[PDB]
Design a protein around this ligand. Structure first.
Ligand SMILES: CC[C@H]1C(=O)Nc2ccc(F)cc2N1C(=O)OC(C)C
Lengths: 516, 400
């Protein structure tokens, strides 16, 4: 049959020795049947009273064995599964069949040397009587390594059939097995029955044609067809009063949609969460919140389908600014034939600019794509080479964007201002420190309250901008402030900053310098 | 032929490093490669009982269209138990050789193999991804040089005594060959070596190019030498000066800071009084040479920081204690990332040559970017330790 995977207990630790809690004669009975059957099948075997190990068993009938102690003392296995494929990455198929694999673990041997640790005990109805000792010969449901080992096996069992049927695709996920091809309806169905046999020859039983689930396929929050994909039904509650919990659950749900339903916005809603004091607290919806919700339920009213990856065609990514710190994008191969869409709202760092953010968007997408299509898409961006170039060659950190083409789809990202690379001639010079003193004799000492050494160094500068003319030279000692402005941000969490940014955008020329 | 008992450092366990996702182009390479290494028993598929993992990547080579498999044993080497001619640096020329294939003959301790577990990922997780483990000595693993050292000596011993005018230094998978011969004769002699290797069963690292250590002079600090000096210029002057005073404490600004008397207009042109003139000159004279008293100690980590000077120009510095620079340099000439990789590599290769160890880097780049493109340009067989940072404003000014 199949190759036994050698297992071992964690170093030093020893097998479990936890006693079997008490059991109803009713339950003893039922268990002895279950076990005698399991012993006939060979999954377990009676052992000598010399085996000092034991794992509890209770009944649901159904035999339920508590392996947590053993699991705690069992070696770590190779992770059962990090990522799951994402629809946008899969290919179109003429037929897709899902195969349930009943009693998977029961059909797989267990490292012989390990078996002794799986020992459990069936109480004797008569108390004068000693109970029966058993141990497993196969993967015990509920045991640490069953998943990993089962899957491992499955692969080997599949490798062959896979070689002989390269024109067939198989994805294993837990106990389900997905098989697809582009064979005519009938030939397809025959391989399925070929495979089912293959599995059966390894004792693996599968569901009869009349019984297997039929597409759409509800998988990991999706709904798969063999030609197109989407996300399962999505209904927004119509309701008079909303509770933070309601709000939170709702926003959460809306995000899920963003991956295929473009135009979804949660701004106003997320906003309702500010200052909240309890999950059960009711929050009334602002006018804009209502607006946003209605618009969303509108988008969700009509189903939209994602299409499958055609590895023959290029991947194209397009990004848009859908609000301050908000970006939308959609990857397609066939013109507007979406494979997937999405948003990006991440502002990494307290301050930034569209150029910097647009680029961070590109990096997420780049990473996503490699993961899904194993390649990066040609990007279509609302920023001009020059603009980027300029910001690029002047920024201290390094960065690189793959091949991308400018798309004149407003709003086009740009930099709202630039610091002169040189002090300005004929522009007043302000020395800040909370106030300033200028070369032209002016001064404005203003004492601020509830400030920070940093927000204060920022204040000075601001004042200076305000009171200065269209062109100004500013000398500060704050390395901090310097870095911030020097970075040419166009948006910040700090209002002061935004006040300053506003100031800066207005000036004709601004030169900021630093001194100790 | 028996193996050599190798253990991890006491108490340590194996690496379980996550596999950064790869481009199906790099994955395909890896598959082809590992399939073959398998046929030749170099590696073997492993089961679930192995929970360990190290990252693999595929990189290109110089003068070849064949892909090279790189395995990030950085963590593994850090958990591997423990076990340099100051002349190499003085040599006119040094050519780097990839002798990594040497190891593929010596078997690896049966009980250590499980630790070399690596994974070839699959696109979109459409399959569990092939898992492997080493049977022979792996390239990039801290122990292979060691374990193979013996055999390596026997293999070199001849050429060693025959060509004593050369300096052969080995590091990880690389062999550094040094000489002062005229370049022409050099390239010819390198060959005789690699065939004296074929003799025992070997690519040009970097190009078929040679480094010239004799001229890796430290980039000192400099000051703007200009005609007229404006208030701004003076301020920048003083700023850079003060900073540098931390290192060379003989720097005096007193006089220059006197020119900055009051609130003058930035563009106002300030004449330099003698007191000031002789001050700058003196300050200027001090910087002509790196500070005295900076010695390297094997005992400490080698740190390296790179600054982007824009325009395709970069600046780095190698130290162990801050301000205490062992070396400093430049790099110019493509996109940001491509350059940075070339640089790191350049700085690393340099470290190996000078001190026989890789430095720890600080890269002015967002991690996801690095992770995404570095392999697209990497060519070295080793991998320095690195961390990503945010280059302060002034640090870049004061340099270059
Ligand atoms: C087996 C074929 C494979 C594929 O290439 N396209 C489709 C299309 C429709 C489906 F319902 C499934 C899948 N496939 C897949 O891997 O589905 C997992 C996400 C469950």
């Amino acid at each position: 049959p199949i190759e036994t995977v050698p297992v071992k207990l964690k170093p030093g630790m020893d097998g479990p020795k936890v006693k079997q809690w008490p059991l109803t004669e009713e339950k003893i009975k039922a268990l002895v049947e279950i076990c005698t059957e399991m012993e006939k099948e060979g999954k377990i075997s009676k052992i000598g009273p010399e085996n000092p190990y034991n794992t509890p068993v209770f009944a649901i009938w159904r035999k339920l064995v508590d392996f947590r102690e053993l699991n705690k003392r069992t070696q770590d296995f190779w992770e059962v599964q990090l990522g799951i494929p994402h629809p946008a990455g899969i290919k179109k198929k003429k037929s897709v069949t899902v195969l349930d694999v009943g009693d998977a673990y029961f059909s797989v041997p267990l490292d012989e040397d390990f078996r002794k640790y799986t020992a459990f005990t069936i109480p004797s109805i008569n108390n004068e009587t000693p109970g029966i000792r058993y141990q497993y010969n196969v993967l015990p449901q509920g045991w640490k390594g069953s998943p990993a080992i089962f899957q491992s096996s499955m692969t080997k069992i599949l490798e062959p059939f896979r070689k002989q049927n390269p024109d067939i695709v198989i994805y294993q996920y837990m106990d389900d097995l997905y098989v697809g091809s582009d064979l005519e309806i009938g030939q397809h169905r025959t391989k399925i029955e070929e495979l089912r046999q293959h599995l059966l020859r390894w004792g693996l039983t599968t569901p009869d044609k009349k019984h297997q689930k039929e597409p759409p396929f509800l998988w990991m929050g999706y709904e798969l067809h063999p030609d197109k994909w989407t996300v399962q039904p999505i209904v927004l509650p119509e309701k008079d009063s909303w509770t933070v919990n309601d709000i939170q659950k709702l926003v959460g749900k809306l995000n899920w949609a963003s991956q295929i339903y473009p135009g979804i916005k949660v701004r106003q809603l997320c906003k309702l969460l500010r200052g909240t004091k309890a999950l059960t607290e009711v929050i009334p919806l602002t006018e804009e919140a209502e607006l946003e919700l209605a618009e969303n339920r509108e988008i969700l009213k009509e189903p939209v389908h994602g299409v499958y990856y055609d590895p023959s065609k290029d991947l194209i990514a397009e990004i848009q600014k859908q609000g301050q710190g908000q970006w939308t994008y959609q990857i397609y191969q066939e013109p507007f034939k979406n494979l997937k869409t999405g948003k990006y709202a991440r502002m990494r760092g307290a301050h930034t600019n569209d150029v910097k953010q647009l680029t961070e968007a590109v990096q997420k997408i780049t990473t996503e794509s490699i993961v899904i299509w194993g390649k990066t898409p040609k990007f279509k961006l609302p920023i001009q080479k020059e603009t980027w170039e300029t910001w690029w060659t002047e920024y201290w950190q390094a960065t690189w964007i793959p091949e991308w083409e400018f798309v004149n789809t407003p709003p086009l990202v740009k930099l709202w201002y630039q610091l002169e690379k040189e002090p300005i001639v004929g522009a007043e010079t302000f020395y800040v420190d909370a106030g300033y003193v200028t070369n032209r004799g002016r001064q404005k000492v203003v004492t601020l309250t509830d400030t920070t050494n940093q927000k204060t160094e920022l204040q000075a500068i601001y004042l200076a901008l305000q009171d200065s003319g269209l062109e100004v030279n500013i000398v500060t000692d704050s390395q901090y402030a310097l870095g911030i402005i020097q970075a040419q941000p166009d948006q910040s969490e700090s209002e002061l900053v935004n006040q300053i940014i506003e100031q800066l955008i207005k000036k004709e020329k601004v030169y900021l310098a630093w001194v100790p | 032929i028996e193996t050599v008992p190798v253990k991890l450092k006491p108490g340590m366990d194996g690496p379980k490093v996550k596999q950064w996702p790869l481009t199906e182009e790099k994955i395909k390479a890896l598959v082809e490669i590992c399939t073959e290494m398998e046929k030749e028993g170099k590696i073997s598929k492993i089961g679930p009982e192995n929970p360990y993992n190290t990252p693999v990547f595929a990189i290109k080579k110089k003068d070849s269209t064949k892909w090279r498999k790189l395995v990030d044993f950085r963590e593994l080497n850090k958990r591997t138990q423990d076990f340099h001619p100051a002349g190499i640096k003085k040599k006119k020329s040094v050519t780097v050789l990839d002798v990594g294939d040497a190891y593929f003959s010596v078997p690896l301790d049966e009980d250590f193999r499980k630790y070399t577990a690596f994974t070839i990922p699959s696109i979109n997780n459409e399959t569990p991804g092939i898992r492997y483990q080493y049977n022979v000595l792996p390239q990039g693993w801290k122990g292979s040089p060691a374990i193979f050292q013996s055999s390596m000596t026997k293999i070199l011993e001849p050429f060693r005594k025959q060509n004593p005018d050369i300096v052969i230094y080995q590091y990880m998978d690389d062999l550094y060959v040094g000489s002062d011969l005229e370049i022409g004769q050099h390239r010819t002699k390198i060959e005789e070596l690699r065939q004296h290797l074929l003799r025992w069963g070997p690519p040009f690292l970097w190009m078929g190019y040679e480094l010239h250590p004799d001229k890796w002079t430290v980039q000192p600090i400099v000051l703007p030498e200009k005609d007229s000096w404006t208030v701004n210029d003076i301020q920048k002057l003083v700023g850079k000066l003060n900073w540098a005073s931390q290192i060379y404490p003989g720097i005096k600004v007193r006089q220059l800071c006197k020119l900055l008397r009051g609130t003058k207009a930035l563009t106002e042109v300030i004449p330099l009084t003698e007191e000031a003139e002789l001050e700058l000159a003196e300050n200027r004279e001090i910087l002509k040479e790196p500070v005295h008293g900076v010695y390297y100690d094997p005992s400490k980590d080698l740190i390296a920081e790179i600054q982007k000077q824009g325009q395709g120009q970069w600046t780095y510095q190698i130290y162990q204690e801050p301000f205490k620079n062992l070396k400093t340099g430049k790099y110019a000439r493509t996109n940001d990332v491509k350059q940075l990789t070339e640089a790191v590599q350049k700085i690393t290769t340099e470290s190996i040559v000078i001190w026989g160890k890789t430095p720890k880097f600080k890269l002015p780049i967002q991690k996801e970017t690095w992770e995404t493109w570095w392999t697209e340009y990497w060519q070295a067989t080793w991998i320095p330790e690195w961390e990503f940072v945010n280059t302060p404003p002034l640090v870049k000014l004061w340099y270059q």
